[PDB]
């Protein structure tokens, strides 16, 4: 997260870190056994880490649970990043509490102008590299489809939306991939892509979760 703030320990209780020897992506806990992340975060050997703040220190509220299976969206295209969504099932159910909690799926799509919370452990610089160890947060509005398409001609599908600031300076970044965009207590987006980070006229692009609720519910119900 570039141009954000330190969230505060366990203030984003649905935020997970995906770990394969090291943090490589974020995710969102949507019930006791399932995490939603980006399809481009797919790999084998995933451990889901819940209750994290400093991802380099065991602080006492963590739960570490290995994934039993990952399910990439059947229509995911890794070239265009269309349908950039994946489900991860935990080998055992997480113990839900005030610091480890699921986030609700949307009942309706969120509109341009809606304020959302984006979070993650990704790079905090737009040029160069600095990875925080504590969770970072950014409040950002959803942008209009027209401004999104104008920023990224030929690249924005009906399964994507832009959020952030056209002036630059505030954005998600590398390492935030797969993490949540939450608006009015609903998971509306997944950190997907962008051209660099926090660059003028290149806002963050996010997977439009409301298009996938039926797929998510049906997949969970049979897996
Ligand atoms: Ca920790």
> How far, in Å, is the centroid of ligand 1 from the Cα of 30?
20
**Could you tell me the CATH number of the domain that includes residue 96?**
2.40.10.10
Q: Is 139 strand, coil or helix?
A: strand
User: In this structure, are 156 and 180 located in the same domain?
Assistant: yes
Range of the structural domain that residue 173 is part of: 1-12+103-210
In this structure, the answer to whether residues 202 and 111 fall within a common structural domain is yes
* Residues 8 and 108 reside in one and the same domain: yes
Residues 4 and 107 both lie in one domain: yes
| Cβ count within 10 A of residue 115 | 12
37 labelled as ligand-binding? no
State CA 110 to chain mean position distance.
16
The residue length of the chain stands at 223
Same domain, 107 and 184: yes
Residue 13 CA to residue 51 CA, distance in Å, equals: 6
Please give the positions annotated as active site: 40, 84, 177
Q: Are residues 78 and 118 in the same domain?
A: no
Please check whether residues 112 and 198 belong to one and the same domain. Answer: yes
Among 96, 98, 171, residue whose Cα is nearest residue 179: 171
- Answer yes or no: do 72 and 171 share one domain: no
Q: How far is the CA of 45 from the centre of ligand 1 (A)?
A: 19
Rg from Cα positions in the chain? 16
Same domain (yes/no): 195, 217:
no
> Does 85 share its domain with 19?
yes
Residue 177 labeled ligand binder:
yes
The resolution, in Å, is 1.7
What CA–CA distances, in Å, run from 104 to 1, 31, 36, 99, 187? Answer: 23, 9, 11, 15, 6
Instruction: Tell whether residue 35 is among the known ligand binding residues.
Output: no
* Total number of domains constituting the chain: 2
Q: Could you tell me if 1 and 44 lie in one domain? A: no
Residues followed by a break in the chain, C–N over 2.5 Å? none
Q: Is 21 annotated as a binding residue?
A: no
Q: Which two tokens stand for residue 123?
A: 């790079």
Residue that is written with structure tokens 């897996």 in the block:
223
CA end-to-end distance (rounded Å), the chain: 33
Q: Judge if 126 and 73 occupy the same domain.
A: no
Three-class DSSP category at 27 = strand
Residue 97: partners with Cβ closer than 8 Å, 6 or more residues away: none
Nearest in space to 30 (alpha carbons), one of 150, 142, 180, 136: 180
Q: In 49-206, which ranges are continuous DSSP H helix?
A: 145-151
CA–centroid distance, residue 76 to ligand 1 (Å)? 32
């Amino acid at each position: 997260i570039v141009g954000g703030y330190t969230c505060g320990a366990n203030t984003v209780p649905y935020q997970v870190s995906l770990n394969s020897g090291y943090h490589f992506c974020g995710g969102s806990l949507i019930n006791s056994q399932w995490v939603v992340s980006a399809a481009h975060c797919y790999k084998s050997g995933i451990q889901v880490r819940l209750g994290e703040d400093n991802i380099n220190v065991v602080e006492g509220n963590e739960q570490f649970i290995s994934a039993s299976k990952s399910i990439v969206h059947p229509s995911y295209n890794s070239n265009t990043l269309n349908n950039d969504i994946m489900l991860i099932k935990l080998k055992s159910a997480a113990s839900l509490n005030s610091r480890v909690a699921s986030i609700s799926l949307p009942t309706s799509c969120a509109s341009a102008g809606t304020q959302c919370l984006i979070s993650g452990w990704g790079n905090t610089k737009s040029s160069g590299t600095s990875y925080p160890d504590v969770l970072k947060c950014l409040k950002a509005p959803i942008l209009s489809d027209s401004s999104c398409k104008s920023a990224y001609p030929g690249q924005i599908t009906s399964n994507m939306f832009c959020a952030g600031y056209l002036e630059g300076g505030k954005d998600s970044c590398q390492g935030d991939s797969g993490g949540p965009v939450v608006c009015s207590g609903k998971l509306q987006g997944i950190v997907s892509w962008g051209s660099g980070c926090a660059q003028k006229n290149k806002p963050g692009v996010y997977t439009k979760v409301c298009n996938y609720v039926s797929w998510i519910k049906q997949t969970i119900a049979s897996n």
